């Protein structure tokens, strides 16, 4: 019975209940219907320029409003991507490749042959076209392991970019910056759609009225059903009461609410982000059971009751694991219930198993931790990557969602490389951050320690490693989005938020979701407080 320790949440009751006035709602849709098909037609615009097109895309995208038109964007992608017409200026050759490449589009990196030199390396001639080194800067993201030619195009349109930045007019300047501490694919989507419309088109001076108004009501308008709800799920965890009953686990629902909402946030997707929220919370509370409370012999009784899975076996464990695993049979059991009306009730196993495999593992965790034992890096990985959770999390995230197959769920049974590389981006980037608290305290069973260890280097060179690990991981996430793809792309980007997410999380190397004050609550306001001032 170790110390407390853990910052309680900052919130409070302040998402306990929404009214949502309906009022303000109709009004906002009524409006965005015609917002909507006004912007449809300027898609279908005939007689338009390649750049143009590319740049109504991209803003269409940024703006957050691309969801409606899925099918519009795709068909306008499929015809560049076939034409293949040379615009030759950097700007609009490097935002060709990352459209396309985002949307599936095997395009070669040829593209940017012309321009580097015969060496192969960037042209410095173009260290003066700001616009063309911001899109190159960004596109560079997206390169996968076969994309050789972009090898230093981020070191390129970097260093280029810091230099020319304190000099450039507004939002230029701005969005420069920003890019330069958060780039565009490797970002959440509602957290870089709010700073686009409220911290750069709006304050853009050629700035398309007819978009940023469109912008600013649709995102509002969702932002009405993110907090509804956020509402109800507040009130399903005030009903579990873990705050005074399990004193020891992180009261941090807002924050994972925020998880849920960053693997998807348009409103389809609702049944879907209530049920994450829910599994995230709870998987959150075992965490700290095995983590900062729970003894030797009692998790050891935990794991067994969580892998026969059945109620009886609540009797073995002590009072306060009998709520935990109550909480979480009866979980599922609602879940079984949700979709019993669309008979896909069938599929919560696939997620049970998961949730299995995290607590065995968790267990493992532990034993290890007794021990003091050390692993080689491959067999410590081979562990540590199911506790991540990020398996279970993704396994999660089909569960609401309609379109979801038995088959869909198969593939991602596999553990495919798309959804490996997510879970090992988790992985580094946690220990990498979570390393001094965990050793400065001792813990040789850390994922810098064994690697450190087994490859006999040192820490700023172990962490170096773990790095390069995510930087292939990375590539090969980019590589998973290329068609054909395994499974509808309505199920790959799930996952590709699950790293976005860990990304903008563990950003300032900080513990995000443990510490959420300078990483992130303000997110939180942005998205689930302020709306944006029309
Ligand atoms: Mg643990």
């Known amino acids: 019975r170790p110390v407390a320790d853990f910052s309680p949440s900052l ?47 991209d803003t269409i995208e940024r703006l957050g409003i691309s969801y409606h038109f899925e099918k519009e964007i ?19 050759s490097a935002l060709q490749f990352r459209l396309l490449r ?36 960004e596109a560079s993201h997206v390169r996968t392991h076969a994309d050789d030619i972009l090898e230093d195009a981020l070191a390129f349109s970097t260093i280029h970019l810091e230099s020319a930045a304190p000099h450039l007019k507004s939002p230029l300047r701005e969005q420069v910056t920003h890019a330069l501490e958060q780039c565009l694919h490797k970002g959440v989507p509602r957290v870089e759609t709010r700073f686009f419309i409220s911290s750069i088109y709006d304050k853009e001076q050629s700035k398309n009225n007819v978009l940023l108004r469109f912008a600013k009501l649709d995102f509002n308008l969702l932002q009405m059903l993110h907090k509804q709800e956020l509402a109800q799920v507040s009130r399903w965890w005030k009903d579990l009461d873990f705050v005074t009953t399990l004193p020891y686990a992180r009261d941090r629902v807002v924050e994972c609410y925020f998880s849920a909402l960053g693997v998807y946030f348009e409103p389809q997707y609702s049944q879907a982000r209530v049920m994450l929220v829910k599994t995230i919370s709870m998987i959150s509370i075992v965490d700290d059971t095995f983590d900062a409370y729970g003894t030797v012999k009692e998790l050891e009784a ?42 896909r009730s ?21 034993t290890w931790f007794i021990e003091g034992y050390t692993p080689p890096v491959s067999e410590y990985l081979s562990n540590a990557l199911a506790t991540t959770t990020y398996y279970y999390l993704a396994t999660t995230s089909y569960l609401g969602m309609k379109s979801a197959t038995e088959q869909d769920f198969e593939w991602l049974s596999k553990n495919p490389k798309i959804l490996e590389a997510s879970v090992i981006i988790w992985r580094v980037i946690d220990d990498t951050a979570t390393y001094e608290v965990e050793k400065s305290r001792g813990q040789i069973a850390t994922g810098i320690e064994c690697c450190m260890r087994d490859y006999g280097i040192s820490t700023k060179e172990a962490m170096a490693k ?11 996430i980019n590589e998973g989005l290329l068609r054909p793809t395994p ?19 563990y950003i300032h190397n900080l513990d995000g979701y443990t510490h959420p004050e300078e990483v992130l609550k303000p997110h939180i306001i942005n998205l689930l407080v302020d709306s944006i001032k029309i």
């Open 11 to 57: 919130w409070g009751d302040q998402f306990l209940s929404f009214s949502i006035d309906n009022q303000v709602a109709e009004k906002y849709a009524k409006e965005i219907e015609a917002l909507k098909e006004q912007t449809r037609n300027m898609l279908l615009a005939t007689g338009m320029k390649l750049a143009d097109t590319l740049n109504l895309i």
């Open 74 to 92: 795709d068909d306008i992608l499929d015809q560049i991507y076939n034409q293949n017409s040379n615009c030759n200026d950097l700007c609009t």
């Open 102 to 137: 985002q949307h599936g589009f095997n395009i070669s990196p040829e593209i940017f042959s012309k321009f580097q030199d015969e060496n192969g390396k960037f042209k410095e001639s173009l260290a003066s076209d700001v616009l063309g080194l911001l899109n190159l800067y």
């Open 302 to 343: 935990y794991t067994d009751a969580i892998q026969r899975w059945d109620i009886n076996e609540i009797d073995r464990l002590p009072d306060y694991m009998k709520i935990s695993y109550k909480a979480i049979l009866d979980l599922y059991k609602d879940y079984e219930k949700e979709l019993s009306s669309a008979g």
């Open 346 to 366: 069938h599929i919560v196993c696939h997620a049970i198993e998961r949730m299995k495999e995290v607590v065995r593992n968790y267990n493992v965790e532990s």
């Open 466 to 476: 773990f790095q390069n690990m995510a930087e292939t991981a990375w590539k090969d």
């Open 487 to 505: 499974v509808s792309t309505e199920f790959l980007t799930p996952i590709l938020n699950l790293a976005r997410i860990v990304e903008v999380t």
